[PDB]
């Protein structure tokens, strides 16, 4: 689990710092490769960031902003690839790392291994305690095809800086220590060489290496230019298919592999979609739809079959919240591609408020591919039961890039997400819900699908208070796990279910309309089965599955009346056909 996803929060204040630190830790601890963006913002003076130690690779941009920490241990960060860029220009942005309007603020970038930026520049502004930043030969770190990269570095301070250690080859370091010298890997090489470990031809890295190397060959790179194929840097992964040399039929390559980030993988990671093209993604490629085989992307046979979009997608890409202008856009939808967010502006902006009953559109919703975010929600509604049949929030898109379920500041008394069995990825953040019990009631363990996931939770109704009012799970709920009060909110029913009510026994032996049991569901015996005494009443739903007929039998069926096709009661009660026409 060298691999995590980053976040996509930019400069946004976390709704709660307490949880912000926990998320950061959960997200990054043990992580070596960040897919997406490494964003470290609003971190207090007292913050232990050792969980960051192991990061060697950042696919998107790195942003260290609005922090009071004196240091962030990214000493092992080797390459940032700049796949996405901050303010569309920057692969590394270090901003406003100094106290609110001893003392606080980041002192030294400490990026001693940072030896490759593939795309995008560097933005270092308003860092009052920060020294050294203007000492680095960015020219070296930027890739050969990235010199045109923007660099905008501010050296206004608030402490007087001493020069780099005399031990550092030119003026160049990441910090004060003889251990902090910039090692140069591009400007210092023999002939037309992209990367090296020293001034000699023999010091030259393979052409497939990205940040330096420890030897001359494609197995010795500090990072891959493109793809890491089983510890060997390669331009591209092996194709999922070989072609017949005469016919050109697809033949499976046993060596074939999918590209996941800058890696070659035998199988897409759990929550990603496999492509026909041999890649792993989170949205399908053009004229390609998803199917379940696990989840693949294929070519649409007939022209791509239309779909229902959530926020973050299509005409709703730059749309904030679900509002009275777009809510009916979800009428009838089983599956929303993208997200749903309810914010104050959703209810009480001159824009007409969502009335609670409009919300009912979501009754058919079973899957959100994106996230679910709730930061306002009708007082009159005690739960999320409009989402009762929501089975799976996949989190291929994450609120702030971090959370796939968010519930904050809501008024709700319980969750009622009684169908939800998966949080594909992302974290769950349930904070500041005054009256909300039945949170530590849900076996979060079971919804999560990777170890980077957890439930982050504060300022909801204190648990002893919930019990003090007598608000536990119902008896009939297996293992004390539920989404809210009463026999309809169990995670797994411990006995039998009639409809959606978890019940003690089905009416198999006793009780007004008799029943049989199919996989723990109580289903009605056909009304024409004679309820039996001391024995079962039927074997299934049909009128030929009775032990005995309540009235007559037109074999194989028990029936109310003989049909009048004109038939008449036998003496034994079975319908014979009338002999006259």
């Amino acid at each position, epitope marked *: 689990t060298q691999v995590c996803t980053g976040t996509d929060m930019k400069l946004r204040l976390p709704a709660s710092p307490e949880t912000h630190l926990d998320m950061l830790r959960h997200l990054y601890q043990g992580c070596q490769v960040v897919q997406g963006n490494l964003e470290l913002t609003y971190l207090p003076t007292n913050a232990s960031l050792s969980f960051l130690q192991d990061i060697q690779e950042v696919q998107g941009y790195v942003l260290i902003a609005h922090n009071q920490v004196r240091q962030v241990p990214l000493q092992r960060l080797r390459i940032v690839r700049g796949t996405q860029l901050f303010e569309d220009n920057y692969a590394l942005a270090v901003l406003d790392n100094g106290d609110p309007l001893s003392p606080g603020g980041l002192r030294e970038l400490q990026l001693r291994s940072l030896t490759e930026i593939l795309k995008g520049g560097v933005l270092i502004q308003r860092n009052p305690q920060l020294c050294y930043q203007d000492t680095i030969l960015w020219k070296d770190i930027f890739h050969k095809n990235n010199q045109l990269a923007l660099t905008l570095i501010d050296t206004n301070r608030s402490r007087a800086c001493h020069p780099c250690s005399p031990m550092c080859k030119g003026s160049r370091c990441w910090g004060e220590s003889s251990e902090d010298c910039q090692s140069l890997t591009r400007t210092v090489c023999a002939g037309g060489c992209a990367r090296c470990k020293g001034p000699l031809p023999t010091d030259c890295c393979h052409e497939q290496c990205a940040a330096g190397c420890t030897g001359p060959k494609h197995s010795d790179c500090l990072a891959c230019l493109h793809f890491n194929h089983s510890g060997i840097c390669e331009l591209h992964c092996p194709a999922l298919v070989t072609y017949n040399t005469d016919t050109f039929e697809s033949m499976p390559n046993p060596e074939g592999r999918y590209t996941f980030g800058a890696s070659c993988v035998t199988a897409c990671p759990y929550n990603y979609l496999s492509t026909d093209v041999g890649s792993c993604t989170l949205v399908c490629p053009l004229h390609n739809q998803e199917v379940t085989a696990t989840q693949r992307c294929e070519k649409c046979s007939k022209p791509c079959a239309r779909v229902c979009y959530g926020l973050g997608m299509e005409h709703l890409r730059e749309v904030r919240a679900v509002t009275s202008a777009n809510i009916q856009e979800f009428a009838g939808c089983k599956k929303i591609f993208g997200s749903l967010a309810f914010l104050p502006e959703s209810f009480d902006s001159n824009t007409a408020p969502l009335q609670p009953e409009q919300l009912q559109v979501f009754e058919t919703l079973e899957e959100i591919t994106g996230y679910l975010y709730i930061s306002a929600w009708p007082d009159s509604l005690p739960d999320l039961s409009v989402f009762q049949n929501l089975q799976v929030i996949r989190g291929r898109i994450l609120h702030n890039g971090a959370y796939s379920l968010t519930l904050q500041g809501l008024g709700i008394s319980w969750l009622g997400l009684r169908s939800l069995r998966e949080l594909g990825s992302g974290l769950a953040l349930i904070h500041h819900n005054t009256h909300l019990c039945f949170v530590h009631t849900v076996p979060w363990d079971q919804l999560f699908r990777n170890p980077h996931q957890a439930l982050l939770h504060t300022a909801n109704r204190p648990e002893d208070e919930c019990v003090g009012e007598g608000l536990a799970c119902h008896q009939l709920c297996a293992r004390g796990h539920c989404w809210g009060p009463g026999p309809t909110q169990c995670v797994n029913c411990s006995q039998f279910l009639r409809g959606q009510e978890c019940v003690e026994e089905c009416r198999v032996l006793q009780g007004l309309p008799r029943e049989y049991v199919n996989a723990r569901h109580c289903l009605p015996c056909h009304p024409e089965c004679q309820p039996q005494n001391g024995s079962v009443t039927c074997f299934g739903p*049909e009128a030929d599955q009775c032990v005995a007929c309540a009235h007559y039998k*037109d074999p194989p069926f028990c029936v109310a009346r003989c049909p009048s096709i004109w038939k008449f009661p036998d003496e034994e009660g*079975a319908c014979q056909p009338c002999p006259i026409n």
Partner: antibody
Amino acid sequence: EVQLVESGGGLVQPGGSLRLSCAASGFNIKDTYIHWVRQAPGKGLEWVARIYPTNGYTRYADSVKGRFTISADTSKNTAYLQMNSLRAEDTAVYYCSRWGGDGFYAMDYWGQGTLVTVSS
Amino acid sequence: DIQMTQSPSSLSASVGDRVTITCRASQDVNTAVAWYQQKPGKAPKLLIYSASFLYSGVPSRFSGSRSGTDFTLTISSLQPEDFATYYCQQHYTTPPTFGQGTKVEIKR
């Protein structure tokens, strides 16, 4: 005339699947039970499955339960037998039949049959 | 699971003959018994239902009776077209079951 047409017959590899189809013509399948009945070469008639399309309630012979799946598509007026995990025992002519009528539980109409032949 | 024992498994009769085909039910089946005729490479066709009722457009030469659990198909004046396999079926319970069939051959 009422009419029931089987299709989908042909060679299956042992272990393989196959989907038989029965298009009804001249009555609605929702109004009755549809059975599939099969006949190995030179052997008797063997009831396989029945479906009641109004509610999709099914019943199955022991020799097929878990492999074969009966189903209906009311819009297409068509019944199906989804035959999974076939073996040489299963080589037979598959007919489709109804219990035409609501107090008439004899099989009044039958399709022409499709030969399924299970073989490597 | 109601079994239907059909005998004989095959018979030879000539044109004009009165042929009889029996079938015993393993348990009580009331009147829920049907008779089918299958001809070389054809679907079976229904002859008799509810034990003794001539189906629409079947020659009156075909007759069915019950005598307890024994059920009898009678072809009363065998004709050449009557060359076929004949099958009782019970539908008293589900599953419905077929007899083994009895082959009628014509002696000319």
